[PDB]
């Protein structure tokens, strides 16, 4: 009924980033958000921690003009209270370890949409902030769109929080705060009505 | 009950590759395999056509020796009947889009176990045979390690089929051919159990 029981000592995280283009090795990482999640004594799944950052585009990188029309982002507006990509994921990486001792996990792993791009920008940004022992599983992925394919037949984000019974402001779409609490909030719901219908533990199944 | 309707028009493949490193663009694609999947009248799932090759390296590819320790395979034996990554993919693209259209899908998205690795090989694969429309959604995948986490509490491929009541052969894990079997068949197994269980279609919960 632990957190550390139900994803083999997996710690899972949910994130998601907005950034200034398709390439995490060449393209500015912009925002990152981060919730850790929980479990209560009776098994049910729920959202833990919450952070969230706008971050400053890292020295020497690109910015793709239409990433930017896309998520509306300015990196050049003095007021958007960015932070260094060390600042940013420092803190994260702080929570996410702290989290993983206190619930007995071995290890975090990034739940996210189509999570292979949130991982690989993150990994980068790591990488360039030149940050020890992340405690993010190296190529693991708990990945929502394929979850919520299974679950609710849906694999936008969108549709799926919709489907799920959930809200979604279109408005607040280009928001990684905003899309981390909806995915985390997707993904809990996932994992509980599984178990809520008797598919988690494997034993319930036979009613014990 | 119709397999279009199940992930909103997507049509599912089962991939597994075996390669010479890391490294999707500069490392040889050594194996293939991929499974279509179908669903019967009454909406349940399971594999339809078997595809399996030995690819021969790129020219130019790297070959990482130790990758080539971890699998077993030999590039250079002449007997292992390998063809070029355009005659195996161009195959595999042939029956997709034929499934496909028999099917009334829209796209083909990869499922696969830590799916972006393998999705990431394939699709370079594609580039460097320039192939044209490739039936794979560009960036959408079917992860199971994910999928064998909600379902089953389980990451690992052998760990999530034993689980799931499957047998699996150590001795077979380097083929692709094997892998996408297991694979396959540990998809079909999740998506089924939550079928039954009275998971999908949505209705049937309401219905007891
Ligand atoms: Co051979
Ligand atoms: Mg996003
Ligand atoms: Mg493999």
Redesign the interface.
């Known amino acids: 009924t632990g957190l550390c029981?139900?994803?083999?000592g997996?710690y899972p995280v949910v994130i998601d980033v907005e950034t200034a283009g398709f390439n995490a090795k060449t393209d500015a990482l912009l925002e990152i958000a981060a919730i850790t999640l929980k479990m209560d004594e009776q098994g049910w799944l729920m959202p833990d921690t919450t952070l969230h950052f706008h971050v400053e585009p890292f020295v020497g990188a690109n910015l793709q003009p239409e990433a930017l029309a896309f998520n509306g982002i300015d990196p050049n507006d003095p007021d958007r209270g960015a932070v260094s990509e060390y600042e940013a994921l420092h803190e994260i990486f702080k929570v996410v370890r702290k989290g993983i001792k206190a619930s007995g996990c071995n290890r975090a792993?990034m739940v996210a949409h189509?999570?292979?791009?949130d991982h690989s920008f993150m990994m980068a940004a790591a990488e360039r902030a030149s940050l020890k022992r992340n405690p993010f599983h190296p190529?693991?992925?708990?990945?929502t769109?394929?979850?919520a394919?299974?679950?609710?037949?849906?694999?936008?984000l969108s549709?799926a929080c919709q489907?799920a019974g959930m809200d979604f402001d279109s408005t607040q779409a280009h928001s990684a705060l905003y899309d981390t609490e909806r995915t985390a909030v997707l993904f809990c719901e996932?994992?509980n009505?599984?178990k809520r219908?008797?598919?988690?533990?494997?034993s319930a199944?036979e009613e014990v």
Chains 1, 2 share one sequence.
């Open positions: 029981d139900r994803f083999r997996f792993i189509n999570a292979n791009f190529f693991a992925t708990f990945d769109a394929a979850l394919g299974l679950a609710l037949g849906q694999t936008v549709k489907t996932i994992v009505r599984w219908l008797g598919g988690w533990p494997l199944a």
